[model samples]
Target chain A: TTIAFLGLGNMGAPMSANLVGAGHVVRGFDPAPTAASGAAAHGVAVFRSAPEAVAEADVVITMLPTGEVVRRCYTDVLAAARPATLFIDSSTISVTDAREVHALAESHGMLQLDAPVSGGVKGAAAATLAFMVGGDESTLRRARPVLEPMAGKIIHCGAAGAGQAAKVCNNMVLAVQQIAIAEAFVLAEKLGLSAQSLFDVITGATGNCWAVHTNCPVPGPVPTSPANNDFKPGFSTALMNKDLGLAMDAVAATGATAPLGSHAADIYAKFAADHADLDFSAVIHTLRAR
Target chain B: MMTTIAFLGLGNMGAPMSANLVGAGHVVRGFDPAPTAASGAAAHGVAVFRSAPEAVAEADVVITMLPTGEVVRRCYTDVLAAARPATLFIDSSTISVTDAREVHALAESHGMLQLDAPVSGGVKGAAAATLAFMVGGDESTLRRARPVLEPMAGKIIHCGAAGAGQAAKVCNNMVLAVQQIAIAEAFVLAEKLGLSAQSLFDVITGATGNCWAVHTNCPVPGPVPTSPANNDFKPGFSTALMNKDLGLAMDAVAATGATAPLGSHAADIYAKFAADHADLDFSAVIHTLRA
Candidate 1:
């Protein structure tokens, strides 16, 4: 099968490589010379342009950066790709933009799924991403085998925009929960409780979550957490801020009352401006410094 | 060796917890100001007495699981004079760290051993003897209190010195309150976005958003069958109690100069919810966001 893969950046490069590793003929493109060259090294047939890659493919998979870029990139790809080609967008974009892209695909006589993913770059590299798909069940059934190589789990969330909706909603809870654990640790430090003791108690009790249990904000509690390594990016603050931006946009678009999610977005917005490259758990420093 | 235990505050948590002590083969002398709790404990094999003083007269260990620090203080004051020499006192109430320290000082003055052994896991855990106890006190005292704690605790963590148990409890509950609100808001956002509660639950419970709020006490029914959300928001832990604990967290924040914006905001949210739904589970805060 011929697969057109676009946007070979941090996540897309390895994800496209996984498709190549799975024995599919992967035609990839990235405007960045390094990203394009990097994918070429991994057996991807690197293309100079997205439409050139899409022109002769059975399936088109995009892992672009933003809603604007996805919408703009698809404008050309939709016109270039074969009329019946399956288009799977694995980008984290807005629900409205996702739905619009789905509509755009149908208008061009192509099948589409707004299949935003979780598990970060590592998940993408390991081909273990959990895809939250938004589209018709029939489209997903057809896209299942194509998705299987890069997915650990897949859920058909609902109609047109539901994948992005689930992604933003899940991420909004994640943003708030991460901050909540960070705040608890900061308060614990001030009140003379050891981070390990707090971690010990919460993990066995109600406060237990993936944040404190897996990606603890404080060092020495969970040895594998980003906190153990001076807060490196298991998942970056900028990406979290980006997802949170999408969430707050959905909150406004749908008039959903999400005070904690809103505050979390505001918190990350400020943090990301300075610590864009740091792990999101570095959010603890904001509360710790005060 | 048989132990004579004085179980104070035979309320919902205390009654069952003391029953476990009796089941463990210790002699439990129980007391409560209320007749219903006193009789409830007595029926569970506790030797119920009329007053706090009489209950502690011959006990070797005194465990108080009261509501407030003031109630624990009052009950301790009324009973300490009657306690046998070296009667170890374990206050398992969720109180402020400052209050726990004051109680610790009081227990020391009375020549008694004390531990601020606050617990989590709610009333169901109490009845099942699966509660998690976060103990704060000297190692020697905790060791002495261990056997007594054993029958009621599923896990006992020695956090630190005096009052650290309360510190740990407040810090954890501060996180719990915020996480619950975050979960509730996410569910509400999911609802408005046409994402089903079960789908959102499935995704988040396996993702970074996973916490006891979503994994165990999911704000909506169907994901977790035993959650308070399924039983019409019937308190695994009440909103009123959560608000009270958050107040204790705020007191710690002010005392320690710790910054807690989200914890403070969550406190305000629970404070509002608790005004009307004081008896409902903290998970029921979802209704306010849903409305």
Candidate 2:
């Protein structure tokens, strides 16, 4: 498939590389020449603008940074793409912006699917990204073949805004659990329990969660986690704050009473504000510091 | 290979656990304040003694699965003095760390070894002989207790010295309570945001959101077939049980000054929810939010 990929930055460069490596003819574009050049090295045709890159393509995928950028890209490219060209937004954005993008795409006779992804840049490079999609069945069917090249799994959440809803809630839940998982370790240590001992028990018992098994915040508990790497940016605090902010936006949009979800956003926002350079797993430091 | 096992407090959790001990071919002596509590054990051929002293008189090991620290302390101090010397005592109650350590000191002073082996996996885990025990005692004593605990425990994790098991248990339950409420809140917000419960579970179970609460015991009906959500809110672990666990957790929180904001809130909410309904599943906290 002739795919037009926009926003060839950190996530997009590798993602576009994977799509191109998987035999999709990807025309990649970004305002920065270096980003386009990086994708060009992986055999993507580097273009100057998103609209020109997407022109004459069967499917267009946008992987921009913010909701505003994602919205503007669609409005920019919608008129030029052939009638009803499939557009998949792999960017993390608010549900309101997603609905507006859908409305704008519909106004221009285009089919748009919100297909925001998880699994970070490494997952993109490894072609193991998980795509949470929000769109209709027929639109998803058309988008599946395109999404399959870059994702490890694709889940259809619901119509229009469900992909954003899925990503929002997934991250919100992740943020909340991250805080609690850290608290468990910190509390265990303070209460005459060894970090290794608590980690050994909780990882095998009912207290087991992704934060413990995947990105264990403490130093000695799990050797493979980010904490073992001198707090490297496996996944950063600022990025977590970014996703949680979107999640909180979605929560407030629907007038939902999400105490933990809302509190998690504030916690991560502060952590990001203080330690934006550190990995998200390092949110444990806040617990440890206290 | 069979040892004389004395089991006290034959309640909801204790009955099944001691029955498993009997099933493992051990000589079981059971005693509880409630006569009906011992009735369930008699069907499994357990010897139901009238008093705690009479129960542990000739037993090689004594195991207590009581409700609170006060009961555990009283059970050990009053009745266990009549217990045979050198009998290993294992307490699986979720009590304060101070209580566990204080009891261990009493046991050690009496020439007996004690393992604070508070468990997780809830009531269903007990009936199936698959409860996970977070043991806090010496590795040498754990080896001696291993064969006895093996029948009742699917997994035995050696946490640390005495009082650490209680610490691990309280922290584990606190984490469990916090995770469940967090999961319920996240799902409710997502449902409000237009995602299906099924959709959220699909991604969360595979993503950073993965946990026993969301993956195995999700509040709303989704991926897990046997989750409490599907069985009309029948509890895998009841709200009252969680309230009990969380109360112990907050005890540790004040003891250690852990600054756990969410853990406290969950205890408060579960207490209120349990007060209203008496016994909905922990997953039913989702409905409480909806209501």
Candidate 3:
């Protein structure tokens, strides 16, 4: 099947490459010469414009930065695609924008799927992303083949913007968990337990957590982890701050009572502003130092 | 060395903990009114007496486990004169820091070495002899008492001098209560977001916000083992005891002028749980969501 891919950024470049590698004829386009050239280097057929890319495509998959860009790009480009072309947006954007995009596609007699995903840049490179899909059942079914090549776990969250909702909820939980892990470590240190001993106890005991065990924020004990390697930008603080900012916007619009996540948003905002150059994992250091 | 040890208020915990000392080659002298005396007699070869004075006479170490501050005061005051000069008095009862300081000062005037060694681990732990002792005393005094205390405790935390053991106890408990409430609140929020409590438990237990409360005293059932939710909250730890500890910590925070915003919030939640579910286990605080 011929798939048209747009927005060849960091995540998008690798994701589009995976589709091309999976034997799908991927027609890629990006306004930036580097992005288009980078996608072409990975066996994708580079196109002059998004409309030109979608001209001979059965599915047009967009992976943009934000909802606003996605809306503008879809309205300008997707309208020119064939009526039966399956539209799949894999961007982390607003639920409103997702619903708006789906409505736009349906109005033009096209099938659209909002399948926002998790698993960072590493996951994208490894083809192990977890896709939380939201759209009509038929649209999802049609896009499954294209999505499976990029995702390890494809969960159909619900119909119409549920993928975006799921993303908000997932990130909110992550924020709360990070704060909690920091607090737990502080409490453990205050109680005279060494971080190593506390980590061992919590990791084995009821307190065995993914944050503590997998993404250990402290160094010395977990030697190979990001924390041990000077808290590198494995996951940049700027990105987390942006994700949390998006969450706050969603909460405000939905009138959701997310006090913890709201508190986390303020914390991440302050962290990002103060240590804009530091990695996101370094937020744990700020929390611990305080 | 033959150390004369005095055991006061030989109740459920005191009796076994005291007996362990007697079994470990200490000359044990015990004092309890009626029931505690009989329990202590069955456990070890103890010299039982009616009053604290007779029990503490010429003792090198004194261990007491009377329930409240008033009882602790009455026993200490009666035994004050009988306590030998340079005696090491170890009070293992859960009491206020003020009471601990008062007794420590009174013992100091009598040239006695007083150590407040508050312990965790329930009666079962006391019987099996594996309690965690948080001791507040001088370095020399703790050194002197370590051998005797080690036989009865799994771990001995030398917190600081005088009333620091009580301080440590209250501080640890305050954090525990705060974390417990935080976990419950997170679970409730997850449920509101159309996520199953079980799914959230699976993910969050693996993710961050994972604490001892989430692992052991899990509020929700069908996921963890030995949680109150699974056993109907039967007696891992009682709600009333948790309420008391939280109240004690709040009192300590107010006394110390500490800005314990999270601790204060937790106290209110536990206070409510204590009032409504006085008979249930402390983990039943999670049931507040249903209301």
TM-score versus the correct structure, for each prediction: 0.96, 0.94, 0.69
Give the least accurate 10-residue stretch of model 3 chain A, judged by summed lDDT.
A200-209
Which 10 consecutive positions of candidate 1 chain A have the poorest summed lDDT? A281-290
- Candidate 1 clashing pairs, residues 3+ apart or interchain: none
* Runs of candidate 1 exceeding 4 Å displacement: A288-290
- Give model 2's DockQ, 2 decimals: 0.66
Among the numbered candidates, top TM-score falls to: 1
* Clashing pairs in model 2, backbone N/Cα/C closer than 3 A: none
Predicted candidate 3 versus true structure: per-residue lDDT over B188-283, tens digit per residue = 554554545565564445433456777677777866877878888886777887788777766665555544444565678788888878788777
DockQ computed for model 3 against the true two-chain complex using alpha carbons: 0.16
DockQ, every prediction:
0.73, 0.66, 0.16
Task: Put down candidate 2 lDDT per residue, B5-65, tens digits, no spaces.
Answer: 9899888889889889888899999998898888988887789987899998998999999
Query: Which is better, 1 or 3, measured by lDDT?
Result: 1
lDDT of 3 at A230: 77
Q: What fnat does each of the candidate structures reach?
A: 0.79, 0.74, 0.08
Please compute and give the TM-score of the first chain of candidate 1 against the native first chain.
Answer: 0.96
Candidate 3 chain B: minimum summed lDDT over ten consecutive residues — where? B200-209
